[PDB]
């Protein structure tokens, strides 16, 4: 009628019993007015989990490298009360191996050691065998290693159905993007997976990833990161956490007596954190969002709700308006995704041009 007034109608039947409730978001609107729909997200009390243990190996890690080997056992036992299933993977890193740091355990960039498995003693073997190394500069190669852990799905074997948790253990801070100019590395990190025989062979030619890049990749493939470090450097990390959503951090005790509890506490915090984000919007499309918590004190701004649990559906208020036609035609992309949940709210945008 050349006046396709606003409505959002969703006829789509998705997997009916998932933790995220939309079929698809189907929005066909004229420029001039907006539309509104609701989404819900519900975590489940036994949702299975996959933990990948990424650890530094530098001389300064001696105090913790010798404990991780036992941590995995006590931890699988504790995790047994928290999830339907549980697997452990493993890898390690030191720094870039280039002439500005070292002459050209011998240092290495990032190496994947063990895919996520059920065999707890394979985990112990993978950890036990890491000899202590070191570098010259104080900061480490952890961000490079995190990226590879987030991208090399084919090497880790992360399940879609299990929460994907990246565990990063350091004593020191990491090197940052652009620091690499000193390394003679002025070529950007493309965000992809570059392991050959589980080795990050491109670590010596690629720039360290930015925080922006780590955030987008970790959120997009739902890998939550739990970070742990000695208490002094911890302040840097705790202050970085607001910058990259989908993260928790805490300190490592001087006797590291709670290493098997750092992920446990974080696990509980992740279960209770239900946040979503609007992403990859098309130029003529504009979205806004707010979350409704059981408390009634609904809020814009914040991505979601805290202090939530099972049998509690977090409600999200989503609205969109339209601008003049852009590079148009019906377009399929995802609009909203809960962080750490595999299901997403897919969208199809339409208009009359």
């Amino acid at each position: 009628i050349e006046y396709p007034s606003v409505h959002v109608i969703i006829p789509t039947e998705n997997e009916i019993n998932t933790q995220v409730t939309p079929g698809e978001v189907s929005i066909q609107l004229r420029p001039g007015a907006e539309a509104n729909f609701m989404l819900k997200v519900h975590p489940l009390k036994k949702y299975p989990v996959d933990l990948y243990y990424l650890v530094d190996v530098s001389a300064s890690m001696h105090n913790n490298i010798e404990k991780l080997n036992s941590v995995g056992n006590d931890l699988s036992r504790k995790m047994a009360f928290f999830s339907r299933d549980f697997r452990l993977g493993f890898g390690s890193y030191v720094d870039k191996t280039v002439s500005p740091y070292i002459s050209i355990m011998p240092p290495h960039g990032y190496i994947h050691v063990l895919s996520l498995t059920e065999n707890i003693t394979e985990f112990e073997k993978a950890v036990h065998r890491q000899k202590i190394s070191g570098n010259i500069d104080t900061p480490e190669g952890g961000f490079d290693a995190m990226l590879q852990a987030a991208v090399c799905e084919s090497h880790i074997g992360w399940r879609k159905e299990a929460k994907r948790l990246l565990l990063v253990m350091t004593d020191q801070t990491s090197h940052l993007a652009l620091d690499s100019k000193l390394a003679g590395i002025v070529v950007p990190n493309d965000g992809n997976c570059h392991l050959k025989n589980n080795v990050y062979v491109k670590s010596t030619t690629m720039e360290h990833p930015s925080l922006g890049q780590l955030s987008e990749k970790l959120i997009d493939n739902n890998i939550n990161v739990i970070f742990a470090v000695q208490g002094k450097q911890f302040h840097w990390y705790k202050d970085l956490l607001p910058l990259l959503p989908g993260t928790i951090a805490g300190e490592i005790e001087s006797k590291a007596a709670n290493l098997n509890n750092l992920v446990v506490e974080a696990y509980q915090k992740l279960i209770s954190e239900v946040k979503v984000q609007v992403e990859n919007q098309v130029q003529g499309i504009y979205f806004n969002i707010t979350a409704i918590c059981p408390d009634g004190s609904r809020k814009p701004g914040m991505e979601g709700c805290r202090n939530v649990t099972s049998n509690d559906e977090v409600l999200f208020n989503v609205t969109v308006t339209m601008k003049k036609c852009d590079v148009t035609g019906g377009k399929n992309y995802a609009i909203i995704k809960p962080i750490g949940f595999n299901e997403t709210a897919k969208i199809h945008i339409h208009r009359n041009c």
Partner: antibody
Amino acid sequence: EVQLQQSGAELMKPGASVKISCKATGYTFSTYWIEWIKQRPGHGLEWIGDILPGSGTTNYNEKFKGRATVTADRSSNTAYMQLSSLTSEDSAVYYCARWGWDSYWGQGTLVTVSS
Amino acid sequence: DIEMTQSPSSLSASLGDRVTISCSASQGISNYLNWYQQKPDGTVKLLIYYTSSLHSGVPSRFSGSGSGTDYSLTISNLEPEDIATYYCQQYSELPYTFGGGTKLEIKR
């Protein structure tokens, strides 16, 4: 339904050993830690040990570290408790278990050790 | 080592009343206590784990809380299926242990 099927009761003399077991079915045997606990005749419950059937690792109650062992066999998919050089105070009802020390346990099997 | 001691001995209350079971540890516990219950002749059941995680198939009359060495189980509106023997199974580090058990009865 998911089940744990425990072996029956027996009578023995002091010095005797017994291997008792508890069959897993309806779930993946190899995925859960399997606990063994016991109830004593007026002393409450005690933990005696455990095993991860999907692995080669076991735990023990220090009191029996040099006396009892715990095992598993992925072929029969049952849990096993190995008790030996037993006396009258080792006579208790033993139980096997599921996920997270679930409510699914064995039934309680007693072996009497006496004169 | 670390041991768990239950404070009640033999408790009793009329059906429909509210009772608590409580216990403490010789050493602190960084993570938890599991609450168990059994019939005089029956398989022990898990009621609550991690202080407040209520086991499925257990009435929501059952609750609990506690600090690392001081925990409790609360059962409101007691019925005959509550009149049972309760246990505290501590979890800190290996070995794991149980208290001696506390029996709940009704008054005569």
